[PDB]
């Protein structure tokens, strides 16, 4: 029902035989010419393999506004994940060192109780 590239509702949907996924013909035809392979699965795929007033002013203006502010805000979202994907891994490794430090602590405390009996 949708294209698996742009996020459109295709006018001329075409499906690839390597990976069952429906793409709009212009967008899939572009990808093959760029690099001859299926975009999702990264499998060998070729082209043959596939199976006035408001409209000019108001509507077209809004479309290029919606594209501009969306990708800019999307670029901002991608930066935040890279910004602190780092805060996740650092806090993770910080926890690993605590477990490793406590692993020596606990068994040693528990072994001192076993020795205490003697």
């Amino acid at each position: 029902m949708l294209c698996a590239i742009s996020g459109k509702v295709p006018r001329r949907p075409v499906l690839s035989p390597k990976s069952r996924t429906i793409f709009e013909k212009s967008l899939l035809e572009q990808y093959v010419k760029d690099t001859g392979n299926d975009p999702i699965t990264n499998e060998p795929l070729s082209i043959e393999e596939i199976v006035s007033i408001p409209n000019l002013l108001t509507s077209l203006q809004n479309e290029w506004d919606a594209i501009m502010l969306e990708n800019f805000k999307l670029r901002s979202t991608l930066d935040s994940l890279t910004k602190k994907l780092s805060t996740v891994m650092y806090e993770r490794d910080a926890a690993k060192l605590v477990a490793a430090q406590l692993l020596m602590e606990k068994n040693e405390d528990s072994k001192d109780l076993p020795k205490s009996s003697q």
Binding site: N107, S110, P114
Partner: protein
Amino acid sequence: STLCHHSLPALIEGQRKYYADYYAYRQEIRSLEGRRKRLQAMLNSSSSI
């Protein structure tokens, strides 16, 4: 619109992602043998005393 938002929160934004949490739980299966194997050796030494 409503359906789209719901799906986005529900399918892309949650249920697919939870699978990753499940995988994390899955590493789990392996920490347990390590947990028990330490306990089993710790029990063996207690038996000697």
